[PDB]
């Protein structure tokens, strides 16, 4: 055996195998990149932010950009469990939205009790978004 060939082969795998590219962002939680992000007509949106319900702080919704994006349903918790969503604190927050017409927009979020009224949130969030 001496031919070593040209070129290299697969073997470390560095690359992603394991994801499929589909949705321009369907999520959104940095709170930098609030440009007027472009979006389309049948794309998702589930929104992915740390929260403890331990506490009682949790993020009241205000802006959900319903005027032009429609959203699927109360229901965002899994009964069963697959890949067991548990990061070390128990229940998360998760907000699937989805695209149905186009419009300028804007989505606004902030940290505080949801059962309280224009009280004093700790932390905030409100980003700009736009369809066509």
């Not at 070129?7 to 940095?30: A, E, F, N």
């Not at 070390?88 to 998760?94: I, M, N, R, V």
């Not at 009790?113 to 736009?130: V, Y």
Request: hydrophobic letters at 30%; charged letters at 25%.
């Amino acid at each position: 055996m001496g031919s070593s060939h040209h070129h290299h082969h697969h073997s470390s795998g560095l690359v992603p195998r394991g994801s499929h590219m589909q949705k321009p962002v369907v999520t959104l939680d940095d709170a930098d990149d609030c440009s007027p992000l472009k979006l389309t007509q049948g794309q998702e949106l589930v929104l992915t932010l740390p929260s403890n319900p331990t506490t009682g702080f949790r993020w009241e919704l205000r802006n959900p950009a319903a005027s032009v994006l429609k959203r699927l349903g109360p229901e965002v918790y899994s009964n069963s469990e697959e890949d067991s969503g548990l990061v070390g604190s128990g229940g998360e927050s998760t907000w699937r939205f989805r695209v149905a017409a186009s419009g300028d927009d804007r989505l606004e979020l902030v940290y505080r009790r949801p059962w309280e009224k224009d009280a004093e949130p700790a932390e905030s969030f409100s980003c700009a978004i736009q369809v066509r």
